[PDB]
Design a protein around this ligand. Sequence first.
Ligand SMILES: O=c1[nH]c2cc(C(F)(F)F)c(N3CCOCC3)cc2n(CP(=O)(O)O)c1=O
Ligand SMILES: O=c1[nH]c2cc(C(F)(F)F)c(N3CCOCC3)cc2n(CP(=O)(O)O)c1=O
Ligand SMILES: O=c1[nH]c2cc(C(F)(F)F)c(N3CCOCC3)cc2n(CP(=O)(O)O)c1=O
Lengths: 176, 175, 405, 399, 404, 405
Amino acid sequence: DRGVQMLLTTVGAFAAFSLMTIAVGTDYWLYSRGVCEEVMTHSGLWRTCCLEGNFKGLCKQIDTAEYFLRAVRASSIFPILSVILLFMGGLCIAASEFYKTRHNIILSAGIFFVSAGLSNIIGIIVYISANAGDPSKKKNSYSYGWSFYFGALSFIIAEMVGVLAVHMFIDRHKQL
Amino acid sequence: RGVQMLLTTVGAFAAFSLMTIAVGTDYWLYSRGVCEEVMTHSGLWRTCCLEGNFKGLCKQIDHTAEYFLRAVRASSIFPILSVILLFMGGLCIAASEFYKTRHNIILSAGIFFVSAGLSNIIGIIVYISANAGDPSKKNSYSYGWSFYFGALSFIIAEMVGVLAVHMFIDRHKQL
Amino acid sequence: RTYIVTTILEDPYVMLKKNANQFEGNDRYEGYCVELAAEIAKHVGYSYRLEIVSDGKYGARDPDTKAWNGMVGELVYGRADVAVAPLTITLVREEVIDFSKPFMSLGISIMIKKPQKSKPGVFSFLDPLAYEIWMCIVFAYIGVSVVLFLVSRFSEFGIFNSLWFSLGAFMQQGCDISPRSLSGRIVGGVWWFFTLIIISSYTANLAAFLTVERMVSPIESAEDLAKQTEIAYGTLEAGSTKEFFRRSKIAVFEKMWTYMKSAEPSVFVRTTEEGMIRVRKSKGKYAYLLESTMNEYIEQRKPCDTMKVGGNLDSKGYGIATPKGSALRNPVNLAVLKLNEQGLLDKLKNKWWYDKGECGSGGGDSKDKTSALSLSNVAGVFYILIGGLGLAMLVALIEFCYKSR
Amino acid sequence: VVVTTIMESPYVMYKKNHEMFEGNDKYEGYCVDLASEIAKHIGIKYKIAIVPDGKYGARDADTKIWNGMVGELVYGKAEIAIAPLTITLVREEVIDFSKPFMSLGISIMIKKPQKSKPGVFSFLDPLAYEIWMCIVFAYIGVSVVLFLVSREFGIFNSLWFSLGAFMQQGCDISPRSLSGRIVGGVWWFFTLIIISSYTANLAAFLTVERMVSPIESAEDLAKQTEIAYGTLDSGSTKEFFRRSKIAVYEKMWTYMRSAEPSVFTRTTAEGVARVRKSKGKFAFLLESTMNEYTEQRKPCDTMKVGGNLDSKGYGVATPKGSSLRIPVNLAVLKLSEAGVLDKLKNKWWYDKGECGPKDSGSKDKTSALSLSNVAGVFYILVGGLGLAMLVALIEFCYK
Amino acid sequence: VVVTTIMESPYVMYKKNHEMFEGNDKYEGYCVDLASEIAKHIGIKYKIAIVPDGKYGARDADTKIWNGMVGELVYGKAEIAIAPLTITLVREEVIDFSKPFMSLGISIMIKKPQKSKPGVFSFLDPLAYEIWMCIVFAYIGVSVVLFLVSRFSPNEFGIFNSLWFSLGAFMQQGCDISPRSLSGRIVGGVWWFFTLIIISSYTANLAAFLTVERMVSPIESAEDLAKQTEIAYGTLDSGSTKEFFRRSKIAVYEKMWTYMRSAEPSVFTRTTAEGVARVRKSKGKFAFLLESTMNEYTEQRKPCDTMKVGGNLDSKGYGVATPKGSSLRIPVNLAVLKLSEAGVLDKLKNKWWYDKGECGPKDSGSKDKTSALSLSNVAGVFYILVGGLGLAMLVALIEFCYKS
Amino acid sequence: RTYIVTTILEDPYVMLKKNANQFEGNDRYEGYCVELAAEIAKHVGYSYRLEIVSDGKYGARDPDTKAWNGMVGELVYGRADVAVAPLTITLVREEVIDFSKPFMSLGISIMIKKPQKSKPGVFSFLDPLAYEIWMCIVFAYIGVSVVLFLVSRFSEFGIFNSLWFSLGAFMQQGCDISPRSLSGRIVGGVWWFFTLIIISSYTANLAAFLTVERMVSPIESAEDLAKQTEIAYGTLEAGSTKEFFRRSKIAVFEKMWTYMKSAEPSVFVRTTEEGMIRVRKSKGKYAYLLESTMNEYIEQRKPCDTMKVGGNLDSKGYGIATPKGSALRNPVNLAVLKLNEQGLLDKLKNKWWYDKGECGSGGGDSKDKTSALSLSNVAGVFYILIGGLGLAMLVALIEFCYKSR
Ligand SMILES: O=c1[nH]c2cc(C(F)(F)F)c(N3CCOCC3)cc2n(CP(=O)(O)O)c1=O
Ligand SMILES: O=c1[nH]c2cc(C(F)(F)F)c(N3CCOCC3)cc2n(CP(=O)(O)O)c1=O
Ligand SMILES: O=c1[nH]c2cc(C(F)(F)F)c(N3CCOCC3)cc2n(CP(=O)(O)O)c1=O
C-alpha cells in the first residue's frame, strides 16, 4: 500500500502549489476594517486594494533587533523564500516520480517541506506581529479573511505531506 | 550488628529524657503576654509568670471540625496520646533490650515511633494554630527550646526508627 | 355639612381604576393617598369627595404677578380646605399656608443602571490569552511534533511516539520517552523552555485579569460619585433639585455642582420618563438624581433594571395642607400623628409599594456575592474535556474497528 | 429667654475649661449651636440651663403630671426647649411641635466584620464545593474509561496513572493506543488549566483580602439568621415592638420571646460592653442618632448601619398659647431648607470624629502567610497519612 | 479709560460669533476678569479696545517706534494696559512694571507615550537584567560540577547527557535516568529547588508587572535631556527662548547651544503651532521647549497628549504697565499686590485654567482597561522558539554533513 | 559719600566668618545676599558698610501699641540707606515703602523623608511565607520520607531511594521509581496533592506581595497629601504659612486647614531646626511645609535623608527695601532687573547652592527605576545553591575516602 500514498503526496503538494499561487496572486488575506473610517479591504502580501470608498478603483503596492524584521515585512522575504523552495520541492518530487532510482532526492524533498513549514510560520508570525503588533489599531478589527485560513490550510497540508513523505523516507530507508 | 541496637537504646532513652523535660516541665515558648510584656512558661497543667506586679505566683492553667481542633488544642489529647504511645514504645524497647527473641514488639515499636512522631508534630501544629491560627491580636512564635525538644522528638525519633527499619530489613533476612 | 378634597395625579397616587369609567367616580381610585384620605376621613368624620385639579401641576410661588396655583393655589383662593395629595415642604408654602405633619421622611436619591452580566462558557476559557495565539501555538505544537519525528528517525520514535512525546512536552507532564541524538535533545529543550514561558504567561495574565476584574467596586454615596468622572450624573432644570444644588454651600455639594455646571454633553433632560429611558438606552454611565419615593417606584417596574444605592442626601418631608383658623387643623394633626405612631402608614406603604409591584417580589434575589470561580467560568473546559473524552470514545470505536474489522 | 437641657451625650457637655465661664458660654455641641442659630435667626437674648429633674420628658400616667421638660413647660417653669424631643401621640395635646429638623429611626448595629480563620474551609476557599465534587466525579469517570479502553492498566494501575496526572507528575508505563493518547492528553490539559485557574483565583483573593458584610444586612436576613439579637428593657423601641402590623416584626417579637431572657439590657453602656466582647453575640436594633454617635467614638471597630427601619421625628417643643410658635416654626423650616443645620450636623458628626478611616478606605500589609490559612493543608496531610497507615495495618491483617 | 489686550492668547475669547453682549464687555478670560477685579478694587471704567499691531511688542531701535501695547502706551493713546507682557530691561526703562501676578518659566515638553511593544526585550522585560547571564553561568557551573560528580565516582552520563539532565530538571518536567548516587542527591535536589523557586518568582513577577502599569516617563529633567542625546530638541526660530539660549552662562547651556548649533532636521521652527503639531504627529523626536503658561494651556487642549516634567529653566513674569508716574500707578500697584496676597487671584487663575479643559478632569490615571496579551508581549518567546528550532535543524544538518 | 547696607543673620543666606577675627570689617559675611550686595554695589556704584539689625528679626507692620521693629522698621526710622536682605512681598510693608523687583520665587512646599529600604539576602528569600511554615514543610518532608521508606519496605526500596522519590514527589520533578502497592500509591497521592497546594499557595503569596509592593502611591503635590490622611503635617504657630492657612480660600486648602485645625497631633514644632529634627526622627510619619529655599538648603547641606516633592503651592516674590523718597530707588531697580534677566544672578544662586553642598543628589546620577528584581531577593537562592553544591562535592570525596580506607 504505497501507490495511493505517492498519489496523496502528489495531490497534497499540488494543493500546496495552488495555495501558494492563490496567496501570491490574489489578496484575500484579511478582512480588515481599513480606510478607503472602517470598511472592508483586500490587503495582500503583494497587492493591497479596496472595494468601497470615494477612490475605489485605484490601488498600489504595500512597500538592533527590529530593523531586520521590518525589512522582512516590507519585502515579504520569508514568504518569497517559502514559495521558491516550495516550487523547488515540486520540481524535485516531479523528478522523483520520474526518477525512482535515486534516494537523496526525497531527502531534499523532505527538507524543502519542513523548511516550507518553518518559513510559512515565520512569515505569518511577522505578518501578524506587524498586523496585531501595532497598538494604535479601530472600533472593528480582527476577523481574519479567507486566505489567512488558506495559509493555515497550506501549513496543515504541509504538515500532512511532511508526515507522509517522511514516512516514504522511513519505509524506503528500511527498504534501503 | 550491636552498634544498631545500642543506637536504638541511646535514641530511645534520649527521646524519653527530652519528652520528660519538654512536656513534664513548662518550658515551651517565650512570649510578651500579660500576667504587660512578660515572659511566660506554659506547659500542660500550670503556667508560670516571671516578672510584673504578680511576681512569685505560678497559676494553674485550664483548657464540625472546629470543635474537634479546639478540643485537641486545649486538652492536648494528641500530645497525650503521643506521650502515652511512646511510653509504651519505651516499655517495649526495655523488653527488646531484655528479650532479644520477640519479633512483634520491636517492629510494633517502630510503628510506635513513627506514629508518635506524627502525633507530636500535629500536636505542635495544633498548639501553634491555637497560638497563630487563633492570633488574638515578631517574637510571639518564639520556641523556648522545648518546641525544639519536640523537633528532636520528631527528627531523632525518625533517625532511630529508620535505623531500626535498617535493622528490620536485615532482620527479615535474619529470620 | 359636606367636605371636599383636592388631589394631584402623577405616580402612583391617584391612579385611575383598571375598569375605566364604569365606576361611580372618586371611589375608582387605587393608590396611597386615596386610601390615606379614606382612612383619615373615617378617623375624624368628613366627606372625601375628590376635586379635579385645575392645571395638574403642584404649583409654585410664581414671583411674576404674584398669586398661586396647584393645590395650594386652590386652597388660598377659596373652595378648597383639605389637600391629601403629598407635596414637599418649602419656605413659600409655609409663608402662605401651614402644614400638619410629614407622613414620611424622604430625600433626594441616586440611582444607577442595574449591573447585568453573563459569564460565558468556552469563551471564558480562551478569554485571558486571545484567540490567534492558541491557533498558532497548536500549529507550532504539531510542527514540532512532525519535525521531532524527522530528527528522531533521521539520524523506535515513530510518528505516534513523537506525537506522544511532543504532547507530554507541550505542557509539562513527563514521559518515559527520551531522545538520544543531540539535535533531538536540543529541540526538546527549546520546546520545553518555550512552553514553560507560555504557561507562566497564561497564569500571570489570568491572575492579573481576575485581580483587575474584582478590584473594581460598585458606586455608592456622594463622595465616591464626586470622585468618579466616568459614571456621569445630572439633574433636570425645571425642578427643586437644581435649586437645592445651587443654593447649597457645603463643600461636596458645591463640588459636584461645579462639576455639572460645565456640562458639555446634553446632560439635562425635560421629563422624568425621558431621563429614565435615556438611562435605559445608555445603561453604562448616567444619573438623574431623582427623589427617593420615585426611585423606589421605578425600582419595582416590569423592565426590572433600576435599583437604589446610597442614602438620603437631604431631609425633605411631605405633608397635608390645611387653611388658617379652620376647625379641621388640630384634629387632622392628631389623626396623622396617630396614624404615624400606629404603624398603619407603614402597612399601607408596604402594601402599595412592595406587595402590588409586578417586579421585585423577592427583592433579595442575588445577595450571596460569591467571589469565587463558580461553574459559570471554567465549566466550558469540563465540556471540551468530556467532549475530548467523547472524541476519545469515537476514536476508540474506530480503532476498535482497526482491531475488529 | 431661658432654655432647659438634659445632660445627654450628643447635644450638650460640660466643657473641660469649667472655670472659663459660668452661665451661657459653658457648653459646646449640636444643641447649643442650633439654639444660637435660631436665636440669631429670630432675634432674642438666649441662655442655657440644665433640667433639675434629670428626666427626658414623659408622663407618669398616674399623678396626672409629666416628668421632665414638658412637665416643667406645662406647669410654668420654661418657655422654650431647644433640646431634642421625639414626637409621639401623648406629647401633642399638651405641647406644640414644629417641623422635623432631623430624621431618625430604628436601625441595626452589629460587631466588626473581620476575616475568618477557618480550618478546613481555608483549604477550599478558592473555587467551590460543586466544582470539586464535579472534578472527583470526572476523575472517577476518566479513570474507569481509560481502564476499560485498554482492555497493563488494571483497576489500580489506571487509578495511579490518573492520580499521577492529577497533580502534574509522570508515570512509568505509557499506553500505545490512539484513544489512550487522546484521553491522556485531554486529562493532562484539563489538569493544568484547572491548577492555573486555582492559583490565579488564590493569588487574586490573597492580594485583595477584601472584606464582605456579614449575613446581618437586612431585616429578612436578620430574621433568617441564627445570631442573637438584643435591645433595651423599656422605651421607644419596646413600645414599638409591643404592637406591630407588619408580621415580620411579629416574627422578631416571637424570636425575642422564645430566646434566652439575656436579650434585655439595662443601659446602653452595658449593652455596648456586652456586644464588644464577641464578634457575634447579640446585635442591636437601636436609635440612628445613638448609632451615629457610637460609630465615631474612640473605639472605631463597630461602625455598621445596615438597613433602615421605622420613621420618627425630632422637633422643638413650644408651650401652648405662645406667640413665638409660628416664629420658631418658620425659623427651623428656613434653617432646614436653606442649609446650615445640615452643615452643622456634618461638621459635628462626620468631621468631628476620632478616626477618619470610615470615610475613605485604606490598604493593609499582606504580611506573612502565617499558619491559619495553611493548617488545613497539614490537617488533610495527617488525615491522608493516618488513613494510609490504617489501611496498611488492615492489609497486613488481611493478607 | 482705555485698556488693551491681545486676542492671540489664552486670556480672551470671542463671545459666540458676533453681536453677542453688545456694548463694552464682550470677551471672557483670565486677564479681563483680573482687570474687572482690580477695577472693583480701585474704581475705573473698562474698555475692550485692541491695538491692531498684532505683535506683543519689540524694541525696534532702527525705527525708534515700539509696536503694539507698549508703543500705544509710551506714545500715548491710553493709561492702563493689562496683558501677557514679559519684563526685561528695554521695556522697563520707558515703562515701569508692577509686581508679577503669576510665576513664569521655560520648560521642555515631550509627547505622551502610548505603549511599549518590544521583541526579545518583551521577554527580557520582567525580572532584572543581569539574571539571565547569571542563570546561564550558574547552569554551566552546576552542569560541569555534577558531571564531575558523576565521572569521579567509579557514571552513565556524559557532558551532553549531564547537560540535558540539568536542563530537564531546570524545565520542571523530569528526565530518563536519575544519577542514583548518594552524592548526587544533594546537588539534584538543590538544583530542583533552584529551578522551582525561579519559575515561581518569574510567574509572580510577570503577574505583578501585568496587573498594573505605571509607565515611567522617558525624561525627567533638563540635565538628563542634555545627557541622553536621543530625542531631537528645538526651541523656535527666534524669540525670547532663542535669545536666552544664544547668550546663556550656566555651564550645561553652552553645551546645549552647541547641540542646537549642529541642527540637521531644522529644529528652528517658524511658528509655535507648527512645532506643537509636529511634536503631536511624531513622539520619537522633535520634543519642544516653551514657556510654562502656554505649556499648561496646551495641557488642557483637545488632543490631550502632552505633559511637563517639572523644573523651571528661567524665571520671569507678566506685569501690568502704566505710562509714567501718576495717581493710577501706585493705585494699580497696590491693587495688584492686594489681590496677589489674597487668595482670590490664584483661585481665579487655577479655576479658569482647570475648568475649560476636559483633558485634566480625569486626574492621575484610569484603571478601566484590562485588554489581553497580544503577540507583542509574546512574539519574543515565539521568535526564540522558532530560532531554536531553526538552529536545531541547522545543527542536525551539519551533524549529517560531519557524520555522513 | 558712604552708604550703609543692613543684613539679617539668616541661616541659608549668610554665613558668619569661620576665620572670624583675623579677617574682619567688610569681609565678615559670606553668602548669597552679601555677594548680591557687592555685585549691585559694583554695578550701580557706591560703598557698602555692613550693619546688623538690633532685634535680629524680620519684623512686621502690625498695628500694635507702637514699638515697631524689624528691617522695614530700620528703614523707616531713617537710620538706613538700602536693605539688601530677604523680604517677602506683602501689604503691611508696602504701605510705607516699596520693594524693587522679585529676583527669586517663593512657594510653600512639603518635604518628606527619603524612603530607603535595603533589600536583604536570605532574609528576603523566605519572606513571603512564615518561618513556622518552612519548618513544618521540612519536618513534613522528612516524616513523609521515612514513612514512605517504611511502607515501601513493609509492602526493592532503600532509604536513599525513598529520599530520592520523596524529593522528586514533593518537588514536582519526575523520576524513574514508582510506589508499588496501593498503600504506597495513596501515600504518594497525598504527598503530591500536599506539595502542589503548598507551591500554589506560595506562588500566590509572593505574587500578592509583589502586587501590593508595586501598587503603591508616592506622595505628589498637595492633593495626594490631603487625601492620604496617614502622615501628619503642620507648620509654625506664626509666619507666612500660618497667615496663608488662616486666609485660605481654595476648597482643598480649606480642607487641609480644617484637618490641621482638628489638632489631633497639633503643630508639634517651635523652631525650624526642632521640626527638622522631629521629622527626621519620625521615620516618615511626619510632614512639614516650608519655604522652598530652606528645602533646597536642607536637601544638600543637611544629611541626605529629607527630599523635596511637589511644586510651589503659591507664587510670592522677593525684593530689597528702598526708601520712598530717595535717589537710590530707580537705578537699583534697573540693576537688579538687569541681573535677573542676564542670568548672573542665577549663576550666583547655582554656585552658592549646588557646588558647596554636602550631598550627592544633584552632583551625581540617581537610581533608574527599571522595576522587576535587582539580584537582591534571589541572592540567597544561588547562595544556598552553591552551598549544597559544595556539600555534595565534599560528601562525594568522603565517600571516596571510605573507598581509599
Ligand atoms: O410639592 C411638590 N412636590 C413634588 C413632588 C414630585 C414627585 F417626586 F414626583 F412626587 C415632583 N416630581 C419631581 C420629579 O419630576 C416630576 C415631578 C415634583 C414636585 N414639585 C415640583 P418641583 O419643584 O419640580 O420639585 C413640588 O412642588
Ligand atoms: O421620646 C423619647 N425619645 C428618646 C430619645 C432618646 C435618644 F436616643 F437619645 F434620642 C432617648 N435616649 C435613649 C438612650 O438613652 C438616652 C436617652 C430616650 C428617649 N425617650 C426615653 P424612653 O421612654 O426610654 O424611650 C423618649 O421617651
Ligand atoms: O513681552 C512679551 N511677552 C510675550 C508673551 C508671550 C506669551 F505669553 F507666551 F504669549 C509670547 N508668546 C511667545 C510664543 O508664541 C506666542 C507668544 C511672546 C511674548 N513676547 C514676544 P518674544 O520676544 O518672542 O517672547 C514679548 O515680547
